[PDB]
Amino acid sequence: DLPPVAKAAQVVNQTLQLDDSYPDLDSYCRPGASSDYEMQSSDSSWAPFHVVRHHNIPDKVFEHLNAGEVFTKLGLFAEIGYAWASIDSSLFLWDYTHPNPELIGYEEATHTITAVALVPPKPGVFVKTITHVLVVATTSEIILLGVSATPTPSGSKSLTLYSTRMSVHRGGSDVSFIVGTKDGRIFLGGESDTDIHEIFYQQEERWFSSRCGKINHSHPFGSRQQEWLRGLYVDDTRNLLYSLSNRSTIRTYHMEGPEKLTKVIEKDKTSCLRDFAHMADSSPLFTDKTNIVALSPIPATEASKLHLMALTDTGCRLFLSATSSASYTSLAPQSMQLQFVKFPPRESPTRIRTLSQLDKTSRALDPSALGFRFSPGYFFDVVRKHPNQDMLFVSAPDTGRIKVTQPASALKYFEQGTWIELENGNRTIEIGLTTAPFAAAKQPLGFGNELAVQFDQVPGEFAVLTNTGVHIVRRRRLVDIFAKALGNCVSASDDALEREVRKFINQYGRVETIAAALAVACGQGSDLMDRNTENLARAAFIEYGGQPRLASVRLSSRHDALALYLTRLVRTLWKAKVVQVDISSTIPTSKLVTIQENVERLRNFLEANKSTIQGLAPPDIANQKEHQALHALQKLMESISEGISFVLMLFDERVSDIYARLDAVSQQQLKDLTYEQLFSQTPGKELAKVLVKAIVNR
């Protein structure tokens, strides 16, 4: 009744939903606490992160820095691969990915530079080629410069600066923190007070208004005690702005309009401590003596309730929710509460490899000087136990264990962690993301599924700026770990592989492990011996793939692995519309090519092992449906490749011309045609037969 490709498409749809059901952050960080870690040596194949390269500071910057009379400062523009150094009233930018960079000097400023930042531009203000705005704050004024960071053949942005005539006198309040919103709004704060200012600017000059203005959103008056800021933090997904003070007070501001900023929550350390005392597990790691050293916003795409992470100097990660009083009039929250605490790990870093209650007393992250969190939870902590050498603790969610955990009430914040040592003299200054922000889905459920996006977006990379250079740290995927582990099994027994494979099964489950073997066998991870590793991966896919059984049948883990891998290769395509009407393609052509290559390499792998892989060759009811299921998947693969080739052929011509000379029903059918329908449904095949028949006649 139902043909092969339609049967296989059913498996894809159900697999997509399974990946998009990956637990949301609120679900495994429920009210309570956790100390769950599996620590890995930094030199281990199971390390969750590792250093890939380093970039020294140019010698000319050292000449200027040691020529500093009063004040110097370093910072990162990780979004574009640039770093900067300010010396008194002079500023120098450079591309740290370049082996011998030239210094972009800017010395117009008259007074000491106190802060520098790279923010998005205000729309409809600048020429489209202006990609960013450079904000330069001195003790006398703030200066805006246009920036064009266009990519080069080498892979590092070319940076050119534009004057703007946009500037405003600073005033009496120091500026040490500058942050920008998605829409180009510029907010300022510093070490004089807790006030937050905003810089406005517009293209047109008016007789009653200048091109650039500044206002204090805090409207202070009367008696005020000493207190200033340690940082500013933006969350565009909620239109919120957070400030952290030197007294560890957390203030939340809501952008109720394009020019408004309203303080809506103020939560001091006492309030946090009161929440903490009402929790089941209190700890001497968080007291009135403890300082909060950093905040990190959590976007609404990642979690509904948990808005914010706060890091203590003892290494505790405080996760705070925020809630509005009502459900309708963005809606501003009015309350903030400490809900969940992740306590520090216990293992300390060691030169030599060392050998179930809540651990709420570890000092391993004491003192924590700097801290950063990146979605879906990558955590960097600069531990400064000694005044000369920083130690870097880096951890990630145990995505494999979180995905397999059952039932939902057993979910905990499992983590994989490691210690990265920086050499003597390296003082960490800043850590920034160099790749695109992580997102496996558009809502909390499914958002954190690292496994699903292993082959759709490169692994996250992070630039660690120190006083001596920039270190690149890269997140490692399951396939990276699996390939590395197998690389160590090349010179060992039949039982050596089985032992290493069992480690993966116990953490990730059998299907995910066999899917990783299939991926490695198909060359995934090789963008980083390699024939033997891929042959070992093939051996693991065959030997440990399981078999089909009567419970309606339960197909082998080998089959589910093939369906899982294939689904993840096309997840960006399946439910997407083929075209966007001047008609164009929803998916960029370059992305369609790589997807097709991946599908074809998978097909090539199955053909070259049609005789050795169980189920491919024809074979009692169990092995029968195993053969039918595997056959249907392979028919979907060739249909996927044909479908992609058809779309590429289509846009090589002039589709808008073809679309014009077309009937309405066929325009409408093409309007809402998805890749799924093209791959696995008759109306999609019949429509493709129309479009080709129109191209051939002209």
């Binding site: 030239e102 210094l103 972009i104 000097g105 800017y106 010395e107 117009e108 409809g124 203000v125 600048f126 020429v127 202006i130 410069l145 246009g146 050119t160 600066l161 534009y162 004057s163 703007t164 005539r165 293209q203």
Partner: peptide, 14 residues
Amino acid sequence: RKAKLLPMEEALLP
């Protein structure tokens, strides 16, 4: 080398 600052005329439209 002091960075060449191209003019405002190019920068902002229209």
